[PDB]
Amino acid sequence: MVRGQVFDVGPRYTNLSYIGEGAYGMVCSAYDNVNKVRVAIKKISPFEHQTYCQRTLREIKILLRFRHENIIGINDIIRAPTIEQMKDVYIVQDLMETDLYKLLKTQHLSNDHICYFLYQILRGLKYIHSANVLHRDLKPSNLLLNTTCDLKICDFGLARVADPDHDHTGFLTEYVATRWYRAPEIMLNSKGYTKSIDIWSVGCILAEMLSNRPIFPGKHYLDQLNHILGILGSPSQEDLNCIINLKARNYLLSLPHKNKVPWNRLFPNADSKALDLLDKMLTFNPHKRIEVEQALAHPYLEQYYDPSDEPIAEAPFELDDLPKEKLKELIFEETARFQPG
Ligand SMILES: *CCC(=O)NCc1ccc2[nH]ncc2c1
């Protein structure tokens, strides 16, 4: 029991402390009596809802398949021994001192810290993209950090397999990513099924590391594009011609001309190489946006870049029509390897 509710992690995990509430529910630290270290445990209660089943299953499947130093692992999964008795699932992960959201609320980052954090983000993202997966919700709170500034990407509940042939859609229809980290094309003509969607989010995170403030702090869904265009300025004729959908194109054409705000005026103390990479990640046109391997090779990251130590997935990667009964059964099968049974 923690703060009124059951938090039932068997005798293996004891001495619980509340960490906080996340996008799944309660998160605690606990002492792992087998490995003799404190661990993080998140309690998930998805089974009444098909969407929460979908996201819980996506995450478990992805994180059990992935193995990478900059991607949070699953150490253990606790649930009841039978489907009938299973109401909650607990996922045990490495304990990490903080996250980049909490860190940016109170700490100025040195240029060497921004450089190292950005390197680790892209190194992890390289592996994710190499598996043909899109994270689709990269943001500071999904970047865990320990006391020696090792970084691990978490939350794969909103991830998808990339599908660029089916990316196109209409105007003001799509809802991918968290608002401040959402690429302009999401509001214009994209379902968020290409790798470029994650690179935009990384760009936003880089900008936020430079000033401790979100770069495009849209106050609601419709406001987000105002902030993006307010800094990038009006898209070029070529970039507009890439938007074939008329509602999206004519919306952009209806706007008064806006000049680009130079990065060096917004970030007068930033490393000029960091601003060059920032510009390339926050490119309006997703086809011209830098890719993860290009980003790693950028002069800003030259102290760290080493492609032989930037591994790829061995094994690159249909839940929407599945009823929740079947997704419970799939979660039960996927978590069976952690049972004493
Ligand atoms: C991806 C966001 C998230 O799951 N935050 C909660 C969390 C997860 C893992 C962890 N390890 N140490 C602290 C935490 C917090």
DSSP for 279-310?
A: HHHT-SSTTTSPPHHHHHTSGGGTTT--GGGS
Integer Cα distance of 38 and 30 in angstroms? 5
DSSP secondary structure letter of residue 324: H
**Coil, strand or helix at 156:** coil
Q: How far apart are CA 12 and CA 86, in angstroms?
A: 18
Resolution (A): 1.8
41 CA to centre of ligand 1 in angstroms: 8
- The amino acid sitting at 69 is E
Assess contact for 203 and 231: CB atoms under 8 A: no
Burial class (CB in 10 A: 0-12, 13-18, 19+), 305: middle
Residue partners of 86: CB distance under 8 A and separation at least 6: 47, 79, 80, 328, 332
Method: X-ray
Ligand 1 centroid to residue 230 C-alpha, Å: 34
Q: Is 154 in the pocket of ligand 1 (CB under 6 A)?
A: yes
Structure tokens at 97: 């001192």
Report whether 143 contacts 125 (CB < 8 A): no
In 10 A of CB 303, how many CB atoms? 11
Crossing angle (nearest 10°) for helices 111-130 and 196-211: 170
Residue 70, ligand 1, Cβ within 6 A: no
Q: Whose CA is closest to 313, among 32, 55, 63, 142?
A: 63
- Asked whether 191 and 169 are in contact (CB, 8 A), the reply is yes
- Assess contact for 182 and 203: CB atoms under 8 A: no
Q: Which of 49, 33, 31, 51 has the alpha carbon at shortest distance from 41?
A: 31
- Taking the CA of residue 155 as reference, the ligand 1 atom at the shortest distance is 1
Which are the contacts of 254, defined by CB distance < 8 A and separation ≥ 6? none
Please report, to the nearest 10 degrees, the dihedral formed by the alpha carbons of residues 206, 211, 213, 214 taken in order: -30
Please tell me the residue having the least CA distance from ligand 1 atom 5: 22
* Full set of structural domains in the chain with CATH: 1-95+323-340 (3.30.200.20), 96-322 (1.10.510.10)
